[PDB]
Amino acid sequence: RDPDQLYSTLKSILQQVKSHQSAWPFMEPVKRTEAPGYYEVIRFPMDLKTMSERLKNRYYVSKKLFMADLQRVFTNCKEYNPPESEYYKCANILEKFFFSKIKEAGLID
Numbered sequence: 001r002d003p004d005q006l007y008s009t010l011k012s013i014l015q016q017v018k019s020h021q022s023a024w025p026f027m028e029p030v031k032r033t034e035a036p037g038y039y040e041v042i043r044f045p046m047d048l049k050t051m052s053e054r055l056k057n058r059y060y061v062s063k064k065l066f067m068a069d070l071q072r073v074f075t076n077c078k079e080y081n082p083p084e085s086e087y088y089k090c091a092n093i094l095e096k097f098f099f100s101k102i103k104e105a106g107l108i109d
């Protein structure tokens with residue numbers, strides 16, 4: 001299936017992203033205990049667990065929707081954290097890896 005093909009390819013890309021050694025900050029929703037005013041500042045939180053559930057719920061009917069959610073993980077991180085923080089550094093490493101996986105899979109809209 002074109003729908004099941006898309007699902008299979010996204011599932012593979014998302015699982016590879018999640019397994020990456022730089023993914024650890026992004027694995028689950030940001031915890032207030034670690035960032036008490038986070039949710040006062042970041043209006044569209046996103047994380048890889050939430051993406052995994054969205055994928056399982058057949059939300060990602062296009063490349064565009066999947067890219068927007070992963071890209072939001074990164075933009076939240078860079079909005080919130082200084083550039084020389086480990087979080088920012090992880091974001092840019094994981095983004096490079098993400099793009100290489102999108103390209104390796106031939107994913108197009």
Ligand SMILES: NC1CCN(C(=O)C2CC2)CC1
Nearest residue numbers: 025026030034035077080087
């Ligand atoms: N003290 C940190 C805790 C984790 N935060 C994040 O932005 C991580 C990257 C997702 C908020 C600030």
